[PDB]
Coordinates of C-alpha atoms in Angstrom, one line a residue:
Chain A
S246 CA 31.4 -10.7 14.6
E247 CA 30.4 -7.3 13.3
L248 CA 27.9 -8.9 11.1
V249 CA 26.0 -10.6 13.9
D250 CA 26.2 -7.5 16.1
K251 CA 24.8 -5.2 13.4
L252 CA 22.1 -7.7 12.6
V253 CA 21.1 -8.1 16.3
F254 CA 21.1 -4.3 16.6
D255 CA 18.8 -4.0 13.6
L256 CA 16.4 -6.6 15.0
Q257 CA 16.3 -4.9 18.4
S258 CA 15.5 -1.6 16.7
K259 CA 12.7 -3.3 14.7
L260 CA 11.3 -4.9 17.9
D261 CA 11.3 -1.4 19.7
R262 CA 9.4 0.1 16.8
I263 CA 6.9 -2.8 16.8
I264 CA 6.3 -2.4 20.5
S265 CA 6.1 1.5 20.4
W266 CA 3.6 1.5 17.4
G267 CA 0.9 -0.2 19.5
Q268 CA 0.9 2.4 22.3
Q269 CA 0.9 5.2 19.8
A270 CA -2.1 3.7 17.9
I271 CA -4.0 3.4 21.2
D272 CA -3.4 7.1 22.1
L273 CA -4.6 8.2 18.7
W274 CA -7.7 6.0 18.9
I275 CA -8.5 7.2 22.5
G276 CA -8.3 10.9 21.2
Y277 CA -10.9 10.1 18.5
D278 CA -13.0 8.0 20.8
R279 CA -13.2 10.7 23.5
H280 CA -14.1 13.2 20.7
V281 CA -16.9 11.1 19.3
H282 CA -18.4 10.5 22.7
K283 CA -18.2 14.2 23.6
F284 CA -19.8 15.1 20.3
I285 CA -22.6 12.5 20.8
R286 CA -23.3 13.7 24.3
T287 CA -23.3 17.3 23.2
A288 CA -25.8 16.5 20.3
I289 CA -28.1 14.2 22.4
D290 CA -28.2 15.7 26.0
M291 CA -27.7 19.5 25.8
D292 CA -30.7 20.4 23.6
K293 CA -33.5 19.7 26.2
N294 CA -36.7 20.8 24.6
Chain B
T81 CA -33.3 50.7 -4.0
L82 CA -31.5 54.0 -4.0
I83 CA -28.6 52.4 -2.0
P84 CA -26.6 49.4 -3.4
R85 CA -27.2 45.8 -2.1
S86 CA -24.6 42.9 -1.8
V87 CA -24.5 39.3 -0.7
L88 CA -22.3 37.3 1.7
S89 CA -19.9 34.5 0.6
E90 CA -20.6 30.8 1.4
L91 CA -17.6 30.6 3.8
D92 CA -19.2 33.6 5.6
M93 CA -22.4 31.5 5.9
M94 CA -20.5 28.5 7.3
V95 CA -18.9 30.7 10.0
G96 CA -22.3 32.4 10.5
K97 CA -24.3 29.3 11.1
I98 CA -21.6 27.9 13.4
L99 CA -21.5 31.2 15.4
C100 CA -25.3 30.8 15.7
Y101 CA -25.0 27.2 17.1
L102 CA -22.2 28.5 19.4
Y103 CA -24.5 31.2 20.8
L104 CA -27.3 28.7 21.6
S105 CA -25.0 26.1 23.1
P106 CA -25.7 26.1 26.9
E107 CA -22.6 23.7 27.3
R108 CA -20.3 26.8 26.6
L109 CA -22.5 29.5 28.3
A110 CA -20.1 29.2 31.4
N111 CA -17.5 31.0 29.3
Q112 CA -19.6 34.2 29.7
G113 CA -19.6 34.7 25.9
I114 CA -15.8 34.7 25.4
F115 CA -14.8 32.2 22.7
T116 CA -11.4 31.6 20.9
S117 CA -10.8 31.2 17.2
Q118 CA -9.5 27.7 17.8
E119 CA -12.7 26.6 19.5
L120 CA -14.7 28.0 16.6
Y121 CA -12.6 26.2 14.1
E122 CA -12.8 22.9 16.1
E123 CA -16.6 23.1 16.3
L124 CA -16.8 23.9 12.5
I125 CA -14.6 20.9 11.5
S126 CA -16.6 18.7 13.9
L127 CA -19.8 19.3 12.0
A128 CA -19.2 20.1 8.3
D129 CA -17.4 17.8 5.8
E130 CA -13.7 18.9 6.4
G131 CA -12.1 17.5 3.2
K132 CA -15.0 18.6 1.0
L133 CA -15.1 22.1 2.6
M134 CA -11.3 22.4 1.9
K135 CA -12.2 22.5 -1.8
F136 CA -13.1 26.2 -1.4
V137 CA -9.6 27.1 0.0
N138 CA -7.8 25.4 -2.8
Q139 CA -9.0 22.9 -5.6
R140 CA -6.0 20.6 -4.9
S141 CA -6.4 20.4 -1.0
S142 CA -6.2 16.9 0.5
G143 CA -5.6 17.5 4.2
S144 CA -2.0 19.0 4.1
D145 CA -1.0 21.3 7.0
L146 CA -0.2 24.2 4.8
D147 CA -3.7 24.1 3.4
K148 CA -5.1 23.6 7.0
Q149 CA -3.3 26.8 8.0
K150 CA -4.6 28.6 4.9
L151 CA -8.2 27.6 5.9
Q152 CA -7.5 28.9 9.4
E153 CA -6.3 32.2 8.0
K154 CA -9.4 32.6 5.6
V155 CA -11.6 31.9 8.7
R156 CA -9.6 34.6 10.6
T157 CA -10.2 37.0 7.6
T158 CA -14.0 36.3 7.3
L159 CA -14.5 36.6 11.1
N160 CA -12.9 40.0 10.9
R161 CA -15.5 41.0 8.1
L162 CA -18.3 39.8 10.4
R163 CA -16.9 42.0 13.1
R164 CA -17.4 45.1 10.8
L165 CA -21.0 44.0 10.3
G166 CA -21.5 44.1 14.1
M167 CA -22.1 40.3 14.4
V168 CA -19.1 39.7 16.9
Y169 CA -16.9 41.9 19.2
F170 CA -13.2 41.3 19.9
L171 CA -11.8 41.7 23.4
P172 CA -10.3 45.2 24.2
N173 CA -6.7 43.8 24.6
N174 CA -6.8 40.3 23.1
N175 CA -7.6 39.6 19.4
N176 CA -7.5 35.8 19.7
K177 CA -10.8 36.0 21.8
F178 CA -14.2 37.5 21.1
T179 CA -17.9 37.8 22.2
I180 CA -21.1 37.0 20.2
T181 CA -24.3 39.1 19.8
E182 CA -27.9 38.1 19.0
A183 CA -27.6 39.5 15.4
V184 CA -26.2 36.1 14.4
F185 CA -29.7 34.6 14.4
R186 CA -30.3 35.8 10.8
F187 CA -28.2 32.8 9.6
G188 CA -31.1 30.6 10.9
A189 CA -33.7 32.3 8.7
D190 CA -33.9 29.1 6.6
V191 CA -35.0 26.8 9.5
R192 CA -36.7 28.8 12.3
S193 CA -40.1 27.4 11.2
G194 CA -40.5 23.6 10.9
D195 CA -41.7 23.5 7.3
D196 CA -40.7 22.4 3.8
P197 CA -37.2 23.9 3.1
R198 CA -38.1 24.8 -0.5
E199 CA -41.1 26.9 0.4
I200 CA -39.1 28.7 3.1
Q201 CA -36.3 29.5 0.6
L202 CA -38.9 30.8 -1.9
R203 CA -40.5 33.0 0.7
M204 CA -37.1 34.4 1.7
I205 CA -36.1 35.2 -1.9
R206 CA -39.5 36.8 -2.4
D207 CA -39.0 39.0 0.7
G208 CA -35.5 40.1 -0.5
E209 CA -33.8 38.5 2.5
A210 CA -31.6 36.0 0.5
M211 CA -30.3 35.2 -2.9
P212 CA -29.1 31.8 -4.3
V213 CA -25.6 31.4 -5.9
Chain C
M1 CA -13.0 -20.6 0.3
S2 CA -10.5 -19.5 -2.4
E3 CA -8.3 -16.6 -0.9
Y4 CA -9.6 -14.7 -4.0
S5 CA -13.4 -14.8 -3.5
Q6 CA -14.1 -12.6 -6.6
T7 CA -14.4 -13.7 -10.2
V8 CA -12.5 -11.7 -12.8
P9 CA -15.7 -9.7 -14.0
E10 CA -16.6 -9.0 -10.3
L11 CA -13.1 -7.8 -9.6
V12 CA -12.9 -5.6 -12.7
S13 CA -16.3 -4.1 -11.8
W14 CA -15.0 -3.6 -8.2
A15 CA -11.7 -2.0 -9.4
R16 CA -13.6 0.4 -11.8
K17 CA -16.1 1.4 -9.0
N18 CA -13.3 2.2 -6.6
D19 CA -11.2 4.1 -9.2
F20 CA -7.9 2.6 -8.2
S21 CA -4.8 3.9 -10.1
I22 CA -1.0 4.1 -9.6
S23 CA 1.0 6.9 -11.3
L24 CA 4.6 7.1 -10.1
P25 CA 6.9 8.9 -12.5
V26 CA 10.6 8.9 -11.8
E27 CA 10.5 11.9 -9.4
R28 CA 7.5 10.5 -7.4
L29 CA 9.1 7.0 -7.2
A30 CA 12.4 8.5 -6.1
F31 CA 10.5 10.5 -3.3
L32 CA 8.7 7.2 -2.2
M33 CA 12.2 5.5 -1.9
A34 CA 13.7 8.5 0.0
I35 CA 10.7 8.3 2.5
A36 CA 11.2 4.5 2.8
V37 CA 14.9 5.0 3.6
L38 CA 14.3 7.9 6.1
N39 CA 11.6 5.8 7.8
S40 CA 14.0 2.8 8.2
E41 CA 16.6 5.1 10.0
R42 CA 14.0 6.1 12.7
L43 CA 13.2 4.7 16.1
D44 CA 9.4 5.5 16.0
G45 CA 8.5 4.5 12.4
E46 CA 6.6 7.9 12.1
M47 CA 7.3 11.0 9.9
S48 CA 6.1 14.6 10.4
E49 CA 4.9 16.8 7.5
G50 CA 8.1 19.0 7.7
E51 CA 10.4 16.0 7.5
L52 CA 8.6 14.8 4.4
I53 CA 8.9 18.3 2.8
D54 CA 12.7 18.2 3.5
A55 CA 12.9 14.8 1.8
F56 CA 11.1 16.1 -1.2
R57 CA 13.5 19.1 -1.4
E58 CA 16.5 16.7 -1.5
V59 CA 14.8 14.8 -4.4
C60 CA 14.1 18.1 -6.3
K61 CA 17.8 19.1 -5.8
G62 CA 18.9 15.6 -7.1
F63 CA 16.7 16.3 -10.2
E64 CA 18.2 19.9 -10.5
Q65 CA 14.7 21.4 -10.3
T66 CA 13.7 25.0 -9.5
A67 CA 13.4 25.9 -5.8
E68 CA 10.2 27.9 -6.7
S69 CA 6.8 26.5 -5.1
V70 CA 8.7 23.5 -3.6
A71 CA 6.5 23.6 -0.5
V72 CA 3.4 23.5 -2.7
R73 CA 4.9 20.7 -4.9
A74 CA 5.8 18.7 -1.8
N75 CA 2.2 19.1 -0.6
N76 CA 0.9 17.9 -3.9
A77 CA 3.2 15.0 -3.9
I78 CA 2.3 14.0 -0.3
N79 CA -1.4 14.4 -1.1
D80 CA -0.9 12.3 -4.2
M81 CA 0.8 9.5 -2.2
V82 CA -2.0 9.5 0.4
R83 CA -4.6 9.5 -2.5
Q84 CA -2.8 6.6 -4.2
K85 CA -2.9 4.7 -0.8
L86 CA 1.0 4.8 -0.3
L87 CA 0.8 6.8 3.0
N88 CA -1.5 6.8 6.0
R89 CA -2.1 10.2 7.6
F90 CA -3.1 10.6 11.3
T91 CA -4.7 13.9 12.3
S92 CA -5.0 14.0 16.2
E93 CA -6.6 16.9 18.1
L94 CA -3.9 16.1 20.8
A95 CA -1.1 16.8 18.3
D96 CA -2.4 20.6 17.9
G97 CA -3.3 19.6 14.3
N98 CA 0.1 18.2 13.3
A99 CA -0.3 15.2 11.0
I100 CA 1.7 12.0 11.6
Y101 CA 2.5 9.8 8.5
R102 CA 3.3 6.1 8.1
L103 CA 3.9 4.1 4.8
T104 CA 1.2 1.6 3.8
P105 CA 1.8 -2.1 3.0
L106 CA 1.6 -1.2 -0.7
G107 CA 4.1 1.8 -0.4
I108 CA 6.5 -0.4 1.5
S109 CA 6.2 -3.3 -1.1
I110 CA 6.9 -0.9 -4.0
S111 CA 9.8 0.9 -2.4
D112 CA 11.4 -2.4 -1.2
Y113 CA 11.3 -3.9 -4.7
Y114 CA 13.7 -1.2 -5.9
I115 CA 15.7 -0.5 -2.8
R116 CA 16.0 -3.9 -1.3
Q117 CA 18.9 -5.9 -3.0
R118 CA 17.2 -9.2 -3.0
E119 CA 19.5 -12.0 -4.2
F120 CA 18.4 -15.6 -4.5
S121 CA 20.2 -17.5 -1.7
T122 CA 20.4 -21.4 -1.5
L123 CA 21.0 -20.8 2.2
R124 CA 17.7 -18.8 2.5
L125 CA 15.9 -21.6 0.7
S126 CA 17.5 -24.3 2.8
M127 CA 16.6 -22.4 6.0
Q128 CA 12.9 -21.8 4.8
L129 CA 12.6 -25.5 3.8
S130 CA 14.0 -26.5 7.2
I131 CA 11.5 -24.3 9.2
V132 CA 8.6 -25.5 7.0
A133 CA 9.7 -29.2 7.4
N134 CA 9.7 -28.8 11.2
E135 CA 6.3 -26.9 11.1
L136 CA 4.7 -29.6 8.8
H137 CA 6.1 -32.4 11.0
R138 CA 4.6 -30.7 14.2
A139 CA 1.2 -30.2 12.4
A140 CA 1.2 -33.9 11.2
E141 CA 2.0 -35.1 14.7
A142 CA -0.8 -32.9 16.2
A143 CA -3.2 -34.2 13.4
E144 CA -2.3 -37.8 14.2
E145 CA -2.7 -37.3 18.0
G146 CA -6.3 -36.3 17.3
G147 CA -8.6 -34.1 19.3
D148 CA -11.6 -31.7 19.2
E149 CA -12.3 -28.9 16.7
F150 CA -10.3 -26.5 18.9
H151 CA -7.2 -28.8 18.9
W152 CA -7.4 -29.1 15.1
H153 CA -7.9 -25.3 14.6
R154 CA -5.1 -24.3 17.0
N155 CA -2.5 -27.1 16.4
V156 CA -3.2 -28.0 12.7
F157 CA -5.2 -25.3 10.8
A158 CA -3.5 -22.2 12.4
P159 CA 0.1 -23.5 11.7
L160 CA -0.7 -24.5 8.1
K161 CA -2.5 -21.2 7.4
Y162 CA -0.4 -18.6 9.2
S163 CA 3.1 -20.2 9.0
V164 CA 3.4 -22.9 6.2
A165 CA 1.3 -21.0 3.7
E166 CA 3.5 -17.8 4.3
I167 CA 6.8 -19.6 4.0
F168 CA 5.6 -21.3 0.7
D169 CA 4.6 -17.8 -0.5
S170 CA 8.1 -16.6 0.4
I171 CA 9.7 -19.4 -1.5
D172 CA 7.5 -18.6 -4.6
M173 CA 8.7 -15.0 -4.4
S174 CA 12.3 -16.2 -4.3
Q175 CA 11.7 -18.2 -7.4
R176 CA 10.2 -15.1 -9.1
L177 CA 13.4 -13.3 -8.1
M178 CA 15.4 -16.1 -9.7
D179 CA 13.3 -15.5 -12.9
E180 CA 14.3 -11.9 -12.9
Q181 CA 18.0 -12.7 -12.3
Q182 CA 17.9 -15.1 -15.3
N183 CA 16.5 -12.4 -17.5
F184 CA 19.4 -10.1 -16.2
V185 CA 21.9 -12.8 -17.2
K186 CA 20.3 -13.0 -20.6
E187 CA 20.6 -9.3 -21.1
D188 CA 24.3 -9.4 -20.0
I189 CA 25.0 -12.3 -22.5
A190 CA 23.3 -10.3 -25.3
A191 CA 25.4 -7.3 -24.4
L192 CA 28.7 -9.2 -24.1
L193 CA 27.9 -10.8 -27.5
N194 CA 27.1 -7.3 -29.1
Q195 CA 30.3 -5.7 -27.8
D196 CA 33.1 -8.3 -28.5
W197 CA 31.7 -11.7 -29.3
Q198 CA 35.1 -13.5 -29.7
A199 CA 36.2 -12.3 -26.2
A200 CA 32.7 -12.9 -24.8
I201 CA 32.5 -16.7 -25.7
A202 CA 34.4 -17.8 -22.5
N203 CA 32.4 -15.3 -20.3
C204 CA 29.1 -16.4 -21.8
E205 CA 29.9 -20.1 -21.3
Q206 CA 30.8 -19.4 -17.6
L207 CA 27.6 -17.4 -17.0
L208 CA 25.5 -20.2 -18.7
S209 CA 27.2 -23.0 -16.7
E210 CA 26.9 -21.1 -13.3
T211 CA 23.2 -20.3 -13.9
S212 CA 22.6 -23.8 -14.9
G213 CA 24.5 -25.1 -11.8
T214 CA 22.5 -22.8 -9.5
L215 CA 19.1 -23.9 -11.0
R216 CA 20.1 -27.5 -10.6
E217 CA 21.3 -27.1 -7.0
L218 CA 17.9 -25.3 -6.3
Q219 CA 15.9 -28.1 -8.0
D220 CA 17.9 -30.7 -6.2
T221 CA 17.2 -28.9 -2.9
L222 CA 13.5 -28.7 -3.8
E223 CA 13.2 -32.3 -4.9
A224 CA 15.0 -33.6 -1.8
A225 CA 12.8 -31.6 0.6
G226 CA 9.5 -31.8 -1.5
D227 CA 9.0 -35.5 -1.0
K228 CA 9.2 -35.1 2.9
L229 CA 6.9 -32.1 2.7
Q230 CA 4.4 -34.0 0.5
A231 CA 4.6 -37.0 2.9
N232 CA 3.7 -34.8 5.8
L233 CA 0.9 -33.1 3.9
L234 CA -0.4 -36.6 3.1
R235 CA -0.1 -37.6 6.8
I236 CA -2.3 -34.6 7.8
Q237 CA -4.8 -35.4 5.0
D238 CA -5.0 -39.0 6.2
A239 CA -5.4 -38.0 9.8
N240 CA -8.1 -35.4 8.8
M241 CA -10.0 -38.1 6.8
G242 CA -9.8 -40.4 9.8
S243 CA -11.0 -37.8 12.4
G244 CA -14.3 -36.9 10.5
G245 CA -12.6 -34.5 8.0
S246 CA -12.7 -30.7 8.3
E247 CA -13.4 -29.4 4.8
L248 CA -11.4 -26.2 5.7
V249 CA -8.3 -28.3 6.6
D250 CA -8.8 -30.4 3.5
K251 CA -9.1 -27.4 1.2
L252 CA -6.0 -25.8 2.9
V253 CA -4.0 -29.0 2.6
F254 CA -5.0 -29.2 -1.1
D255 CA -4.0 -25.6 -1.7
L256 CA -0.6 -26.2 0.0
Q257 CA -0.1 -29.4 -2.1
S258 CA -1.0 -27.4 -5.2
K259 CA 1.4 -24.6 -4.2
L260 CA 4.1 -27.3 -3.5
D261 CA 3.5 -28.9 -6.9
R262 CA 3.9 -25.4 -8.5
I263 CA 7.1 -24.7 -6.6
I264 CA 8.5 -28.2 -7.7
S265 CA 7.3 -27.8 -11.3
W266 CA 8.8 -24.2 -11.6
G267 CA 12.3 -25.6 -11.0
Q268 CA 12.0 -28.2 -13.8
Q269 CA 10.4 -25.6 -16.2
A270 CA 13.1 -23.0 -15.4
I271 CA 15.8 -25.6 -16.1
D272 CA 14.1 -26.5 -19.4
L273 CA 13.8 -22.8 -20.5
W274 CA 17.4 -22.3 -19.5
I275 CA 18.5 -25.4 -21.5
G276 CA 16.7 -23.9 -24.5
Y277 CA 18.4 -20.5 -24.2
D278 CA 21.8 -22.2 -23.6
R279 CA 21.4 -24.2 -26.9
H280 CA 20.3 -21.0 -28.7
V281 CA 23.3 -19.1 -27.5
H282 CA 25.6 -22.0 -28.5
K283 CA 23.9 -22.2 -31.9
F284 CA 24.3 -18.4 -32.4
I285 CA 28.0 -18.7 -31.3
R286 CA 28.5 -21.6 -33.9
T287 CA 26.8 -19.6 -36.6
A288 CA 28.8 -16.5 -35.8
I289 CA 32.1 -18.5 -35.7
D290 CA 31.3 -20.3 -39.0
Chain D
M1 CA 25.6 -3.5 6.0
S2 CA 22.4 -1.3 6.3
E3 CA 19.7 -3.2 4.2
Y4 CA 19.7 0.0 2.2
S5 CA 23.4 0.5 1.3
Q6 CA 22.8 3.9 -0.4
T7 CA 22.3 7.4 1.1
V8 CA 19.3 9.5 -0.1
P9 CA 21.3 11.6 -2.6
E10 CA 23.0 8.4 -4.0
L11 CA 19.6 6.7 -4.2
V12 CA 18.1 9.7 -6.0
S13 CA 21.0 9.8 -8.5
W14 CA 20.7 6.1 -9.0
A15 CA 16.9 6.3 -9.6
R16 CA 17.3 9.2 -12.1
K17 CA 20.0 7.4 -14.1
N18 CA 17.9 4.1 -14.3
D19 CA 14.7 6.0 -15.2
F20 CA 12.4 3.8 -13.1
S21 CA 8.6 4.6 -13.4
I22 CA 5.3 2.9 -12.7
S23 CA 2.2 3.9 -14.7
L24 CA -0.9 1.8 -13.9
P25 CA -4.2 3.6 -14.9
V26 CA -7.4 1.9 -13.7
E27 CA -7.5 -0.4 -16.8
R28 CA -3.9 -1.6 -16.5
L29 CA -4.3 -2.1 -12.7
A30 CA -7.4 -4.2 -13.3
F31 CA -5.5 -6.3 -16.0
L32 CA -2.8 -6.9 -13.5
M33 CA -5.3 -8.1 -10.9
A34 CA -7.1 -10.2 -13.5
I35 CA -3.7 -11.9 -14.4
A36 CA -3.1 -12.5 -10.7
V37 CA -6.5 -14.2 -10.1
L38 CA -6.0 -16.3 -13.3
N39 CA -2.5 -17.4 -12.3
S40 CA -3.6 -18.4 -8.8
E41 CA -6.1 -20.9 -10.3
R42 CA -3.5 -22.6 -12.4
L43 CA -1.2 -25.6 -11.7
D44 CA 1.9 -24.3 -13.6
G45 CA 2.0 -20.6 -12.5
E46 CA 2.6 -19.7 -16.2
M47 CA 0.5 -17.9 -18.7
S48 CA 0.5 -17.9 -22.5
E49 CA 0.1 -14.8 -24.7
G50 CA -3.3 -16.1 -25.9
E51 CA -4.5 -16.4 -22.2
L52 CA -3.2 -12.8 -21.5
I53 CA -5.1 -11.4 -24.6
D54 CA -8.3 -13.3 -23.4
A55 CA -7.8 -11.8 -19.8
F56 CA -7.4 -8.4 -21.4
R57 CA -10.5 -8.9 -23.5
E58 CA -12.4 -9.7 -20.3
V59 CA -11.1 -6.5 -18.7
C60 CA -12.0 -4.4 -21.9
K61 CA -15.6 -5.8 -21.6
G62 CA -15.7 -4.7 -17.9
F63 CA -14.5 -1.1 -19.0
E64 CA -17.3 -1.3 -21.7
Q65 CA -14.6 -0.7 -24.3
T66 CA -15.1 -1.5 -28.1
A67 CA -13.8 -5.0 -29.1
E68 CA -11.9 -3.3 -32.0
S69 CA -8.1 -3.6 -32.0
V70 CA -8.2 -5.5 -28.6
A71 CA -5.3 -7.6 -29.7
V72 CA -3.1 -4.6 -30.4
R73 CA -4.1 -2.9 -27.2
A74 CA -3.4 -6.2 -25.3
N75 CA 0.0 -6.5 -26.9
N76 CA 0.8 -3.0 -25.9
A77 CA -0.5 -3.6 -22.4
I78 CA 1.7 -6.8 -22.1
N79 CA 4.7 -4.9 -23.4
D80 CA 4.1 -2.1 -21.0
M81 CA 3.8 -4.5 -18.1
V82 CA 7.1 -6.2 -19.1
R83 CA 8.8 -2.7 -19.5
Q84 CA 7.5 -1.7 -16.0
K85 CA 9.0 -5.0 -14.6
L86 CA 5.5 -6.5 -13.7
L87 CA 5.7 -9.4 -16.1
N88 CA 8.7 -11.7 -17.1
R89 CA 8.6 -12.9 -20.6
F90 CA 10.3 -16.1 -21.6
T91 CA 10.6 -16.9 -25.4
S92 CA 11.6 -20.6 -25.7
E93 CA 12.3 -22.2 -29.1
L94 CA 10.8 -25.4 -27.5
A95 CA 7.5 -23.7 -26.9
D96 CA 6.9 -23.6 -30.7
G97 CA 7.6 -19.8 -30.7
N98 CA 5.0 -19.1 -28.0
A99 CA 6.0 -16.7 -25.2
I100 CA 5.4 -17.7 -21.5
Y101 CA 4.7 -15.0 -19.0
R102 CA 5.1 -15.0 -15.2
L103 CA 4.3 -12.3 -12.7
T104 CA 7.3 -10.5 -11.0
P105 CA 7.5 -9.9 -7.2
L106 CA 6.4 -6.3 -7.8
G107 CA 3.3 -7.5 -9.9
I108 CA 2.4 -10.0 -7.1
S109 CA 2.8 -7.5 -4.3
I110 CA 0.7 -4.8 -6.0
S111 CA -2.0 -7.3 -7.1
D112 CA -2.1 -9.0 -3.7
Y113 CA -2.6 -5.7 -1.8
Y114 CA -5.9 -5.0 -3.6
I115 CA -7.2 -8.6 -4.1
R116 CA -6.0 -10.5 -0.9
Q117 CA -8.5 -9.7 1.9
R118 CA -5.9 -9.1 4.6
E119 CA -7.5 -8.7 7.9
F120 CA -5.5 -8.4 11.2
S121 CA -5.6 -11.6 13.2
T122 CA -4.6 -12.0 16.8
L123 CA -4.1 -15.7 16.2
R124 CA -1.7 -14.9 13.3
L125 CA 0.3 -12.6 15.5
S126 CA 0.4 -15.2 18.4
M127 CA 1.7 -17.8 16.0
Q128 CA 4.4 -15.6 14.4
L129 CA 5.6 -14.6 18.0
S130 CA 5.7 -18.3 18.9
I131 CA 7.9 -19.2 15.8
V132 CA 10.2 -16.2 16.3
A133 CA 10.5 -17.0 20.1
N134 CA 11.6 -20.6 19.2
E135 CA 14.0 -19.4 16.4
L136 CA 15.6 -16.7 18.7
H137 CA 15.8 -19.3 21.5
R138 CA 17.6 -21.8 19.2
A139 CA 19.9 -19.0 17.9
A140 CA 20.7 -17.9 21.5
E141 CA 21.5 -21.6 22.6
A142 CA 23.7 -21.9 19.4
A143 CA 25.4 -18.6 20.2
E144 CA 26.0 -19.8 23.9
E145 CA 27.3 -23.2 22.7
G146 CA 30.0 -21.2 20.9
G147 CA 31.9 -22.3 17.7

């Protein structure tokens, strides 16, 4: 049934999008987290007097 | 004065104070003084208010890439003006990299003494070092 | 605690403090819809700045607008959508400064209202009523089995709050869609009567009867399922009262009963309004024929 | 059939022809949210014109606006909300000439986005995944049973 095949294909495409979004969000958050930690370490520790 | 006098733009000051912090930074001393425009830009956006600073490039800026590239090009232009003033020297064969000099410390004239900022500013304007806007 | 914790004065003060506003003229709305369509055709649900600019160019072409400053106009439109909370922008150092865009829940809700062809379906309602009946029956069985606060929170409160409440909201939305469809039929009857009223009497009677039949079928489906649903909500309420009585489960069951009463009352009220319009159109036809 | 049956040029031509637009300044948006809160507290999900004018009066007080011509401004706001497809107006002879108002799916989605405190819940996601897993499993068993 072309109607069921198309509907199943659409749901599979939505599921792939839902799974892919989480990994992408984690990568973006990691980039920011690393940057904030680097910034804090630079601000705190490198001035010594 | 018998010779005319002029003042620097606020963007020149932002780039000046950032170049000053870069000179002091022991974390980057390993570079042997060679810095890249991208590193300067990254440090600047790390400290100042990015979206509020964008107001000077264009009154309608809201983080669009065209406006971000416009900001980078203005930085590239002002940095070239600071080179003519002798505050920074480009590499002999590569123009994307440059070296700092101690002359940049004049951008710290408002904070080198741990005192009331208002009084410092008054003293500076009295000495002819700096004007308001 | 009422899903809407803020009183009307607190809410108006909050809205004024935050300066929330939506300004979507025809060109901006068309652009939002074009973005929503382009996003639905993609595998990653993400759009780059260049792709958004290409989409804006196609809208400007459809509006026969000047190709001058299109990149600037597209940037202003993109910034406006971000400023109006329709788009989320991600600026990563890892992406060499290239911003990634995703539509917000608001931008998707507005674009879907215009692009998604939502038709009232008796089959959709019957399916939603079948799923909720099964979910309420499982929650009622779990409530009657008894247990600790953790059993009640995971097997009674969580299904009622995160499944039954959402399906009731979906049914309510379908009823609001039916309200819009009835207003569409009213405009069509007024148009048929304004063009050729003598040739429109048969068509108007058919539209009136078909709309009446659909509303009755819907109300019959809601009344037949509503009693079983009310019985399961009462079973949960009795079980809660017997096992100490969580005020949170009681408030939630009361909210669900109130929503269910609104869903059942809407069908009767829609039928009464439709009967009033039907009589008015027949009176108008009689007066016009006389 | 793609949920969106129309290509981008077809959609743009269609939107241009129907002249669809949304204009909700801060006051109109606050009026919409006020209507949504008032409707959620009610048993019939219906609002009368007098109740809408009172809701608008409460919004005008919040915007520190003059009480002068509030009824005219309220009627214009109500007509604008109906024109923008945010409110459905029902005029029944049986309601003694009094118009009944109900929020449209668009008016509910816009008002809920700002007023409903939607927080991400791992429990909500786990439940939704459990329901879809059971629904997909039943549909797969039905597809394998054939028919």
